[PDB]
Amino acid sequence: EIVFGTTVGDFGDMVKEQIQAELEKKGYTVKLVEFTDYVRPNLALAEGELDINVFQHKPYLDDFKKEHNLDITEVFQVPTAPLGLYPGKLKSLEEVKDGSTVSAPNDPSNFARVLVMLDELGWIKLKDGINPLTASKADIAENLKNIKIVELEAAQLPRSRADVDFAVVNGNYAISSGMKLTEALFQEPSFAYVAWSAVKTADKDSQWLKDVTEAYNSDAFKAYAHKRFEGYKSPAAWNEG
């Protein structure tokens, strides 16, 4: 038996709908433990109550295992609900004007991700040599297109598209509000916040983990993810697949 821990939602659905049967074909059984918060999964992993968890991105994992002194590590990436720039009052990227408004989530990590995206688009230029994970308005070296960024609560972003020219919406709120991820005009190119699986470090070279990694990178899983999770950001190793 391989004991998976996930949050309730997409990451558990991957286990239940595709990964479980794939690993059954390889001699294993899969036991899914669902968690409703983000603190317990790594602790349960570290105490040996889980063999692997799939819920978090690497910035979160790094901070968590540092602060709790856990001997755990990321293993592989999984398809992840993406941060996207969606149409607002304007309907395409080249309609952007000097002074165009962009709504964005106001929590510091998501806001930093928005700034990095706008820098990739060429609408702003961030200072050089900064930590992209903590980018803030102070780090804008040149506002190329004089964009006005309207900071709102993440949950409010789906309703802002009448108020601003473009809206940056988190994948989770895009999904829960009925938006299609494929509607985004521009999806976050960075992989810095794609979700990873995690294990105890002592287990990182184990045979069962090689088989789990294979299952999460198999052709069957890829086709499943392309149908079930259209628009999600794929693991880098899939080559945009």
Residue numbers in the entry: 44 to 284
Passage from the reporting paper:
The bacterial periplasmic methionine‐binding protein MetQ is involved in the import of methionine by the cognate MetNI methionine ATP binding cassette (ABC) transporter. MetQ, the substrate‐binding protein (SBP) for MetNI,5, 6 is proposed to play a dual role in transport by either binding l‐methionine for delivery to the translocation pathway of MetNI, or by facilitating d‐methionine uptake through the ligand‐free form when complexed to the transporter. Structural studies of SBPs in their ligand‐bound and ligand‐free forms have revealed a hinge‐bending or “Venus‐flytrap” mechanism where two domains of SBPs adopt their open conformation with an accessible binding site in the absence of substrate; substrate binding stabilizes the closed conformation, where the two domains come together and sequester the substrate. In this study, we report the structures of the Neisseria meningitides MetQ in substrate‐free form and in complexes with l‐methionine and with d‐methionine, along with the associated binding constants determined by isothermal titration calorimetry.
With the exception of MetQ found in the MetNIQ complex, the structure of substrate‐free MetQ has not been reported. Since MetQ has a high affinity for l‐methionine, preparation of the apo‐MetQ requires cycles of unfolding and refolding to remove the bound ligand. As an alternative approach, mutation of Asn229 to Ala (N229A) in the binding pocket of the E. coli MetQ was found to substantially decrease the affinity toward methionine, thereby greatly facilitating preparation of the substrate‐free form of MetQ. Despite extensive efforts with both approaches, we could not crystallize the substrate‐free form of E. coli MetQ. Structures of the substrate‐free (N238A) and substrate‐bound N. meningitides MetQ are related by a “Venus‐fly trap” hinge‐type movement of the two domains accompanying methionine binding and dissociation. l‐ and d‐methionine bind to the same site on MetQ, and this study emphasizes the important role of asparagine 238 in ligand binding and affinity. As this asparagine residue interacts with both the α‐amino and α‐carboxyl groups of l‐methionine, mutation to alanine would be expected to significantly impair ligand binding. Three distinct conformational states have been characterized to date for MetQ: one liganded and two ligand‐free forms. A thermodynamic analysis demonstrates that ligand‐free MetQ associates with the ATP‐bound form of MetNI ∼40 times more tightly than does liganded MetQ, consistent with the necessity of dissociating methionine from MetQ for transport to occur.
